[PDB]
Amino acid sequence: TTNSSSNHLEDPHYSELTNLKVCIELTGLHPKK
Amino acid sequence: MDKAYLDELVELHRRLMTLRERHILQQIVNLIEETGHFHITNTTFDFDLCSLDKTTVRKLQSYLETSGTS
Secondary structure (H helix, E strand, O other), rough: OOOOOOOOOOOOOOOOOOOOOEEEOOOOOOOOO | HHHHHHHHHHHHHHHHOOOOOOHHHHHHHHHHHOOOOEEEEEOOEEEEOOOOOHHHHHHHHHHHHOOOOO
């Protein structure tokens, strides 16, 4: 793939905090090959 | 505009910190790779849930809809 998109530009709203965001540390899952 | 929905993802989103199964997590991370909507940085997969539609929420829920070592 190289082009698809599905979301861009939104009315003035939302915020930085409180927006349900995830963060999966890849430091745990690091199986050799 | 459905607090119920967001309030629904609030569980996984949080519990996601308790989940460490390198199997399930690594398998889910492969999903967001298809929708094409995330940001790679350092060594953590950062992506927003409210950014994706519902059709994806019911999908990512797949792993959460049936655990038990898959």
